[PDB]
């Protein structure tokens, strides 16, 4: 109900005579494009990631990005204390009743420095003094700037109700987790740390709770999301308990997929 | 460098021995985005080490996934090592099954 179309680009300039540009797109946590500095063209992670762009449209698309990617790098090396590391994060969030926001990030040394915002490129409050220059030329060129305000306003939410239609039964997939129990080393010395594995859920929401009867163990820790390498996701849930009290605990899975019929496994079922 | 990696190992299916499985080595936090990563069994390097695409998150910090194939044992031993311009040393993160 809220789809973020998020086109991530990395460059790194070593020095002079040394830099490299790589992409990636992702529609949510699926990702949608590659593009290796290796590559002339944007290669494709779904058979759906020309969404409903006809050949001629993406090819137009393409082609002005080739161009971007180019006019980047000598732009950037025309300006320029290496190394530099310069991050682009572009797309639109989509919204409900046909409803988006659309926006253009740029970071320096992985600190955010630079956005589009309106019509004009404008450095953020802090960034360093020598960009104020650098941003007034390049907000001389009026071609760019009508450029990337169309892309913001019309291509990104246009694009993305295409890939929402063409992309409908890999978006709305239901992967069912698998759970299993161990524990591993306590920083308290009475104690172990009790862990309830979740993998291989999609899509990512889930509610995994260390459970004595119907009594929830509040102190369950919820690790981080951690990816899968075939677009599933990773959880352990975490319990710290004192020799003895693992007796009667089970770990409680939830998740879309399952339709309401809980994962259950009980510490020490085979005894 | 400006970030330091955290690293986290876990397997994509419960670890039973003698059956066939996917190590992950989740590598996060890091900054610049150049790095090394290396997949280790009984302390040597595994040779079939898929990567993912480099990306990063909303904070800017870089994150890549390493997997390979593996059957785990009783016996043998996995962890993933690091390395990177943030750390003097390599970081290895041990696979915690058994620990
Ligand atoms: C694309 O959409 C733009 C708005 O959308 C946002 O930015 C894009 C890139 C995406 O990130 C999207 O997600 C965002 O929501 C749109 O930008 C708008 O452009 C117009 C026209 O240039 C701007 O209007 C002018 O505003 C100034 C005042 O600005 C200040 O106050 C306003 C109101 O509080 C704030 O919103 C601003 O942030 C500033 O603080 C006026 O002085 C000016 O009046 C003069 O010009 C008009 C038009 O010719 C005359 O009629 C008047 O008589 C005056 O001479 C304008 O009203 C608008 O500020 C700007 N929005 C933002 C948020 O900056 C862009 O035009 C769209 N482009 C296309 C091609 O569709
Ligand atoms: C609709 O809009 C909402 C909000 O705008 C979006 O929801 C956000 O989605 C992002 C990406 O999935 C979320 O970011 C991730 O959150 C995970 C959970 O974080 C919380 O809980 C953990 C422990 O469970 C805490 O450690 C943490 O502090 C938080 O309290 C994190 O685990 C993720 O971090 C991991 O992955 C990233 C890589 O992206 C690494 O950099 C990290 O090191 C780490 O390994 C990650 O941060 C975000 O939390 C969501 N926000 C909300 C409010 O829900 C939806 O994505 C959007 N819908 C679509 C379809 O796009
Ligand atoms: C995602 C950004 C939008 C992409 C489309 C922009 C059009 C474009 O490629 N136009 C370049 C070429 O312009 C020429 O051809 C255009 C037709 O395609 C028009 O005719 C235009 O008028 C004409 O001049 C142009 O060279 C552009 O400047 C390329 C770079 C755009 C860009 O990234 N800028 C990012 C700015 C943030 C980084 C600067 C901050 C910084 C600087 C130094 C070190 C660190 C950080
Ligand atoms: C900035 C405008 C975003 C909306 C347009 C989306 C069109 C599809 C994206 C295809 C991937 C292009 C990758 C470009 C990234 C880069 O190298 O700067
Ligand atoms: C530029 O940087 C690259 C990548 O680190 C390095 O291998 C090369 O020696 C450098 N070349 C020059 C001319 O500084
Ligand atoms: C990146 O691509 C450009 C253009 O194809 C090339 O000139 C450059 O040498 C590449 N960089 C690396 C490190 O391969």
Redesign the interface.
Same mark, same amino acid.
């Given at each position: 109900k809220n789809y973020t179309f998020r086109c /991530?680009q990395?460059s @790194?300039f070593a020095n002079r005579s040394w830099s490299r540009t790589?992409s *990636?797109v992702?529609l949510g946590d699926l &990702?949608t494009h590659?593009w290796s500095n290796d590559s002339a063209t944007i290669s494709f992670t779904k058979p759906w990631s020309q969404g409903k762009l006809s050949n001629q449209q993406w090819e137009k698309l393409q082609h002005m990005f080739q161009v971007h990617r180019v006019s980047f790098t000598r732009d950037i090396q025309e300006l320029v204390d290496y !190394?530099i590391?310069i991050?682009l994060?572009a797309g639109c969030e989509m919204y409900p009743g046909n409803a988006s926001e659309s926006f253009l990030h740029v +970071?320096f &040394? =992985?600190?955010?420095v630079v956005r589009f915002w309106g019509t004009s490129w404008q450095t953020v409050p802090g960034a360093p003094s020598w960009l104020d220059l650098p941003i007034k030329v390049l907000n001389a060129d009026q071609g760019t700037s009508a450029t990337v305000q169309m892309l913001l306003n019309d291509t990104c939410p246009l694009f993305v109700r295409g890939l929402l239609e063409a992309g409908k039964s890999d978006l709305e997939k239901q992967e069912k987790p *698998?759970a299993?129990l @161990?524990s *591993? !080393?306590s920083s308290a010395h009475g104690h172990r740390q009790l862990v309830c594995?979740v @993998? =291989?859920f999609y899509p990512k929401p889930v509610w995994v709770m260390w459970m004595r009867g119907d009594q929830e163990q509040q102190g369950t820790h919820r690790g %981080?999301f /951690? !990816?899968? +390498? %075939?677009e599933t996701w990773?959880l352990?849930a975490t319990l710290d308990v004192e020799a003895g009290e693992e007796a009667g605990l089970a770990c409680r899975v939830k998740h879309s997929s399952l339709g309401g019929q809980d994962i259950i496994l009980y510490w020490h079922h085979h005894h | 460098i400006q970030k330091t990696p955290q690293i986290q190992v876990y397997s994509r299916h419960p670890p039973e021995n003698g059956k066939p499985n996917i190590l992950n080595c989740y590598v996060t936090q890091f900054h610049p985005p150049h790095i090394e990563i290396q997949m280790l069994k009984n302390g040597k390097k595994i040779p079939k080490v898929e990567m993912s695409d480099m990306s990063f998150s909303k904070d800017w910090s870089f994150y890549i996934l390493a997997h390979t194939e593996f059957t785990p044992t009783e016996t043998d031993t996995y962890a993933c090592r690091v390395k990177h311009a943030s750390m003097a040393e390599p970081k290895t993160v041990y696979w915690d099954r058994d620990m």
């Open positions: /991530l990395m @790194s790589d *990636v992702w &990702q590659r !190394p590391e991050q994060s +970071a &040394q =992985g600190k955010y *698998v299993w @161990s *591993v !080393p594995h @993998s =291989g %981080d /951690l !990816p899968n +390498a %075939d990773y352990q | -």
